Amino acid sequence: SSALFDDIFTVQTVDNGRYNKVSRIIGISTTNAIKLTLDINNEMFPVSQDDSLTVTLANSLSWRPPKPTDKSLADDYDYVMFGTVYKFEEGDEDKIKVYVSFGGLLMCLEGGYKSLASLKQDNLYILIRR
């Protein structure tokens, strides 16, 4: 029931290759080697080049409707997708990169410091803010 990632990146660019409602964006990390590739709903959450977003992951807080108005809300963000990750690739050196697909939305992460944080399970909630 813990978090598995926290880091702010900066939109290097936003791509809409023939998609009226979705854009695959990329951005590097502000701390370290860490790049980010992510598809996203430009309609629900607009985003242009050069933005300060905070990306998170982890597993926790059938599928109940709302009613949770009076319940947990690990939604302290403005975009929360659920999906699964498929391949665990190694890009030379000891640099790793996991691939996450959200029921149709692909994603790639890169770096090397979640050697005991990012698991190989299906669980995975993406979060973003500001």
Partner 1 sequence: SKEPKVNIINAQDDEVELMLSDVNLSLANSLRRTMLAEVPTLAIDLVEIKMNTSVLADEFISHRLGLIPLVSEDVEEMKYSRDCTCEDYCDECSVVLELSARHEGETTDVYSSSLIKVSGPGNLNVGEPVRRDDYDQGILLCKLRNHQELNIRCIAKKGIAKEHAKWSPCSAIAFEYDPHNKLKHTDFWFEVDAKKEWPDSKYATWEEPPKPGEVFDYKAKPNRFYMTVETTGSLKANQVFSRGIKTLQEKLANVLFELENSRPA
Partner 2 sequence: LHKMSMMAHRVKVMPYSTFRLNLSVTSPYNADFDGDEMNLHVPQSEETRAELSQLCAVPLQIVSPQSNKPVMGIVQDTLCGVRKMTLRDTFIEYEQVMNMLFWVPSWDGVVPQPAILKPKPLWTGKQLLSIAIPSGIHLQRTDGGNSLLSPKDNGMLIVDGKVMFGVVDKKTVGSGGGGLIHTVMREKGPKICAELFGNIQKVVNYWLLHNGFSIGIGDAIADASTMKEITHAISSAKEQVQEIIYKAQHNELELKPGMTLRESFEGEVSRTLNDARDSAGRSAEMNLKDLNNVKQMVSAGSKGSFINIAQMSACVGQQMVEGKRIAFGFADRSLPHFTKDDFSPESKGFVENSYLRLTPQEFFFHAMAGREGLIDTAVKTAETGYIQRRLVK
Partner 3 sequence: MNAPDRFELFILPDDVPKLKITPDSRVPNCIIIKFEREDHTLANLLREELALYPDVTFVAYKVEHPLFANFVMRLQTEEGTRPKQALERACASIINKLKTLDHKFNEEWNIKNF
The footprint of partner 1 (CB under 8 A) covers 20, 43-44, 46
Backbone CA torsion sign across 53, 54, 56, 60: negative
130 is an interface residue for partner 3 by CB under 8 A: no
Closest separation between CB of residue 60 and partner 3, Å?
Answer: 21
Cβ-based burial of 96 (10 A; exposed 0-12, middle 13-18, buried ≥19): middle
CA angle 40, 85, 48 (to 5 degrees): 20
CA distance 29 to 9: 4
Name which of residues 75 to 114 contact partner 2 (CB under 8 A): 75, 77-84, 86-87, 89, 99, 101-108
Residues near partner 2 (CB under 8 A): 17-22, 24, 37, 39, 41, 44-45, 62-63, 65, 75, 77-84, 86-87, 89, 99, 101-108, 125, 128
Interface contacts to partner 3, rule CB under 8 A: 62, 64-67
